[PDB]
Symmetry: C5
Subunit: 375 residues, 5 copies
Amino acid sequence: TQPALLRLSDHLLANYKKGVRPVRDWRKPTTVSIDVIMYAILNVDEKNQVLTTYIWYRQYWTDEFLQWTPEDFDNVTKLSIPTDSIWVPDILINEFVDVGKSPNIPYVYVHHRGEVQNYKPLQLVTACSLDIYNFPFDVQNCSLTFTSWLHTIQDINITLWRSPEEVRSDKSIFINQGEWELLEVFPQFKEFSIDISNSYAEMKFYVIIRRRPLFYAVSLLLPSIFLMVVDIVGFCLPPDSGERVSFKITLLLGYSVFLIIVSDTLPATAIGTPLIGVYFVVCMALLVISLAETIFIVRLVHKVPDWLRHLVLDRLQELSSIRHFLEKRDEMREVARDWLRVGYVLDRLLFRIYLLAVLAYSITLVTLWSIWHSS
Amino acid sequence: TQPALLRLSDHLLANYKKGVRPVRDWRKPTTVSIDVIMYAILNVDEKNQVLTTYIWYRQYWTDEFLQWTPEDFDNVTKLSIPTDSIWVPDILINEFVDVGKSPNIPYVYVHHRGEVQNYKPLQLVTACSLDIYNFPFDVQNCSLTFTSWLHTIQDINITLWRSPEEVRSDKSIFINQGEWELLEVFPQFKEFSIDISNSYAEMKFYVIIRRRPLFYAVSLLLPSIFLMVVDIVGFCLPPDSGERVSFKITLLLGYSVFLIIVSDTLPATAIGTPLIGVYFVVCMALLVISLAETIFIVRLVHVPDWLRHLVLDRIAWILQELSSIRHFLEKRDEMREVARDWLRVGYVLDRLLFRIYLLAVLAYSITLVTLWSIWHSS
Amino acid sequence: TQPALLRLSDHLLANYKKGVRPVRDWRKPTTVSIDVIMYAILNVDEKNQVLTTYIWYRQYWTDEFLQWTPEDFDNVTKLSIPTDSIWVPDILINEFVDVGKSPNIPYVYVHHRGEVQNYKPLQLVTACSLDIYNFPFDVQNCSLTFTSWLHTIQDINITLWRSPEEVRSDKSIFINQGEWELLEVFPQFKEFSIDISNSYAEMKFYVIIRRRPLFYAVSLLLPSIFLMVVDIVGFCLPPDSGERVSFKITLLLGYSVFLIIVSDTLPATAIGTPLIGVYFVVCMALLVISLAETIFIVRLVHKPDWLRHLVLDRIAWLQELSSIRHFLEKRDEMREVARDWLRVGYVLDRLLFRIYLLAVLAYSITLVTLWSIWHSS
Amino acid sequence: TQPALLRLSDHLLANYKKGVRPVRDWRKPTTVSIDVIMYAILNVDEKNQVLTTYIWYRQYWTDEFLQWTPEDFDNVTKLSIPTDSIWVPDILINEFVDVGKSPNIPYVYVHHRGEVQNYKPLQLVTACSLDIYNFPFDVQNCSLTFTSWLHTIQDINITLWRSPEEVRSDKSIFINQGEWELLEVFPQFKEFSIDISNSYAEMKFYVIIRRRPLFYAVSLLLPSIFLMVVDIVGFCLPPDSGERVSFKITLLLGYSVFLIIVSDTLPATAIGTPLIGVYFVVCMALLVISLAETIFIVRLVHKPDWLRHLVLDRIAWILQELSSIRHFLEKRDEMREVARDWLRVGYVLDRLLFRIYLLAVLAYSITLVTLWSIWHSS
Amino acid sequence: TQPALLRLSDHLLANYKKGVRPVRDWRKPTTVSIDVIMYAILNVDEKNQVLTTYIWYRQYWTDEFLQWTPEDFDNVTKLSIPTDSIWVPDILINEFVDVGKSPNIPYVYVHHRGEVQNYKPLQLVTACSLDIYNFPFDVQNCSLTFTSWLHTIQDINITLWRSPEEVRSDKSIFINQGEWELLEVFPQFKEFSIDISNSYAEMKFYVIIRRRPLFYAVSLLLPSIFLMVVDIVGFCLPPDSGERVSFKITLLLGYSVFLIIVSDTLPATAIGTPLIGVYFVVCMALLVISLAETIFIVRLVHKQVPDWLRHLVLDRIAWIQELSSIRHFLEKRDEMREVARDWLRVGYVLDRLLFRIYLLAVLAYSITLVTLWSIWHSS
């Protein structure tokens, strides 16, 4: 006789209808147990507020018509079937934004009691509101909703193949070598209802991820740390020295190029910039302000009581002539010294507030590190 | 016997024609009620005047042939059917620019009285005349037309499923953390006639959106304002100093490279310009003016009638070897006649350019305030 | 009885063949009248030399088989048909470069005489040579040919639905806020021949467009003139002063920076360069020439007459008290060897000032000329 | 009589199925011998950890039904049959991230005893654990596992066409002009089981490559060594030098410049950054701390003995009116003659600067040479 | 009676197969004469070593079964037929990398004897071994191989339609308005056997091009010469002046901004870079080295090997009362450099040394430019 596999396929698929739900009593639904396994976090576009991932998607459902007695067909129980030749649920993501380029799995398994298995990988693109204020240490709670766009809960009830804990503790395949770590995958069933009698089933996966800030930190923050420190020792230089002026303008140019390119390295979002950029701009502000005051004082030494009060509140005759010129600096010196001292004690104030900004920067970095270490 | 579902599918889709419009009396049209919900705003390319969004698109219509008696089929009333096995209208947006990647919904529901439902999402790409003049604070009355590319109004009359108000305030599904914010969507129906015998139906969901200016603002205004700051202290540098000149040239090339990057950073408009760049370039103008004037007076101190008729008209408009080395000690301070001939001009011009720079940034601030009031009022 | 619409679809589409040209006498061609409207101008890549456009391509032709008596089928004259169930011509563009993502229109009308109408949008990616020589005010005569890639004129002759005047005057559908305006669309029929004995039909559409240079003008031409004027005033500075040299080298830096954005903002064709950059680099050339001559004279300052002959040929067309006074008068007198070259340093400075001003003048002149030529179209 | 080629095709493709695994006894699997060749290494995304390649994939298996007697069919022993007219295995790669654009090869050769040959190219995009620590001279062991997504080892037992030595030796087709090289293609077989009843056969291909570091070498190391020599002559300057500090800030400018150039040029996975930037930042750290030391000296030579005692311990561990106008002159000397002996400790401190900086640049050069040697050791 | 154009389709396409090679004796191959015309060159990825083109590709072969007597069909000798209803060869390119987006020509012509013509526009992408050493004036001879991925010469022997001279000379359709100029397209037939009994026929088309550098000249080469020349006159200066130092630093900033454009406009390739960037590296190196030398001489100006210094200039020459005392102070004030005169000497001649090597690099750059121009103009 003929092979049992061919005979079984002919016996089943003949008089089978793709479009009809594989049920006898229409009043019942047909449930779908699924499973989600995270492979990789491909891209995180903070500006577009989207995510790009790759998963292994498993699916199960029962078809009342794909049933047989194994005894006739040579005790065969399992069978491979083309997925294009059977009914399939239109399960799909609500957070979906753009068609992920993924292959097609033509085949599916079919047991001798209607059960079906549809394993397939899945690239996908989804929307996710990303909080980038703690930019290097930012941690996300993106979702992956699962439901049918059309069919209601009376036709399709989403379920799970496994326990939720077994899903959260599943990291056998995930690659930890990207910029992004994976902490868990927390599922949560829910029912969803546009209006009464329009109830819809739903399943959700609270995907959680964490950023690895080491490259970003060492290549962005520490440059700024060294920059703030060299600004500090520039404040340490003697007041109103052109050496200090060259110092400050060199640092100004450095800050210029630094902020320019790190703006390209720093993806900001609708919130604005993150806190690191805030510290950057304010330390730049203090640098340019101290530069301005230095050049103000060196302008003044070139030959008021109001702000004086304000700031102290804020807490041989020819040779006699050429020796009057020996004394010319002292003659200008009383005014020169008063102006220089007021300018210098302003430099100390700028130094103080720069130190405050640096300390707050360090403290914020420590706090962000700890919250990152919530792991 | 067999299941009622299979029997019914056999009865409904055998001897059915997907290509034929599902009507008995051809003189009738077939109406299509729709609905639109904005899921999110993805991208707004101010350069090419194009928009990209994601919506949920419901549409309803009737088929005279998809009708059955529920009692014959186990009192069943509704059923899913594949899209590919039934007639579908060629509804299409008028202002498409390129097809967007949207997944396919194979199935559609069908009731026992010809009714049909087809729910699906749509990544769409549409042209929109954008006004970049209030670049960070703009509001944009883009549109989403809906009609058939081919079918007349006598075959297809577009309709609205819901009320216009419920469609306006349907902010249930949206994402707010994105760059943009959606103020409302206002539907409107009209007819369209390229010529007689081409009367076509049309909807118009006037999608409205609002920007969020912060990451542009703090990232870009404050470096510009710092350029303004270092320019005013460059005005305050000593007039005689040629370190002032190098300083101000550094600022001039700074304004230049800033114009460069904001050309390579922000999407420069097609028509008009944002006034922010206008304030920036007039700041550059004041910079180069002060530079020219300080080097001018520098070479001077190294035409008093010019000076004095000019200030006159301005006033009208306001309406032994020991004695020798002592002579040398004076010679240290002896060119001050020709120095003071132009040093008052130096000081007064420095203060004047300073003042008008401050006035320019005042107008900058006022423009920012007015745009803020508008952006809030919307 | 049944609806006449379904009866008619069964009458026509049965025993119909998509592949066969819908003709009874093969010797006659199948005319295809078309019409084109430019919805918008999306992008034009001056680096890669392509053009992106969206059009509402219309199309009309005849099928001998799609013919019926309306009276039998309930006085029905018109109906829709799926486009994928009938013969269609292989109309296609010869300037085509890349398959354009565009939606499909699955349906078409058919009248009772055999007529057909296929309305559909169409995105294009076509090659167009571009003159970037007048980069700010450039104007293009891009083309859009239409023809069968395979079929001859003896099978498919192209035609127009409307008159060419109505076409060129057609600007009803357009997005006017983009950079590129539209002036007209000039068609011109033509017959084509890869080789004799195989004659091909064509129907061109000389798309013409024009650029809005306003933001280009602001971002480019005003800072150019600003650097020009800055150098102009810098030239006034005294020759020996090294701050003049610092001025001129830093401004040369600005010149190179502007040239950098020029090379960048213009990723233009390597076949031809605009003249804005030309005027700018000769400006830079005069600046560096001034700089070099300045360093030369500055070195000559402190401590020869062949030089003077040559520029003339050009012009043809108590000991210690005494020591104190000597110190004073020698710090005064070191200018003597300086004057001997400052005499000609001033001359060089002013000649270069003159020629620099001439170059800037010609720059403004050319800019106004191109403004005029722009407005002329 | 009809053709042979024509009436073999009709004999075979009639009553043949595409969903049925081509077997008589279902209990046996159907084996699939393969063979892989690397045509080119197109792109290596160091940031996203992605590999883009292009291969010449071969594929062999057997069909119990596609068999015949050549003697009937004019001694025909091979035939071109379309790929979409017979069963095909769902052999794919686990490491896919996207789908690669590769054209469909419709035809496949078939012998008169079930054997099938399906050659085809496969552009493919996969992930790989990249190692950037040796950023100039990095080498990678990327993998391409081949396995059926669904079918188990009881249905599909993957195997290999040739011997693995033949595969590793095979470099007949490769573009050596790319940024990368090809060292071998090392196969390996494995059974894969997430759990019992999921025994999945597979075959690996450890694609190994190597970078050509010349461009990166000249564009990173040479300016690094330049600035290093500049630091050398930097500390060579004795103390109390305004030249020294002006120089050192010039070096600070250059180091900030090339730090940002470093950030620009190299992309980098954030799991770990390379030693090159480490040497950069630490030598810049040395620059700034010695700058601070110079500043402290400059204020000490201008105008703290516990420092001296602790430093001596540290060093043990290391082991008349004319007269008045002439005084108006001589203060020019007394302004110099004012000196402090803190400078002794200050510039005995600079002895440690020489040591640490030469040590740092030595470590840099030594590790660089080591990376070169390891690159050549491949 | 019905139209012959319909009877013909129903007479041929019935009982026809799309998979069966249209042959009556399997032993013979299906010869496929082809032809290639270059419409345009689109982009050249020197970075990734990839080419992309657009081609008007044609095919000519025979079908044993698509035959008829025109007399029975109203003397009809030709016919259009859907391409997706007949056998087709699996012609494909070996240099192919990724699927290019080309439209589909659903129709093909057919003659009464068996000939089949299938014209189509190919939009193509291929890998090529690109040489950027003469980056402004380079010429890359890329290949476009054509062969069947599966069949052998025993089933498909590829041939050519026109003569190779007609192929080379045919540069009419190519637009000469882009960046890259075309020179010729040389065909070459070949047989291939990586292993035995697999005689995969093929055919190559050596596409050969040339870059138009006139933009790049004014963009990069001319201003680089200006940078070189300002640095020349900088090295015309004495070591004493710190103005020299500030000058070198401003030129250093100029090359600093050159770095960003170099990465952006010169297409940096990891395997190799042009001689141009090498000369620029040399000029930058000599600039910073002269900066180091003049600051060394600035040190030497500052009051604290001199006989060593004179050994080295020999190496060169081989290679080549209050008032009384304050008046004495005036003398030594104008002569306080008394020893640093000796070091200003060597600083000056060292400025001349660095000046020699710098102008040498500059003129070598110029000469190499001229040589590249001559080679370019030669071919």
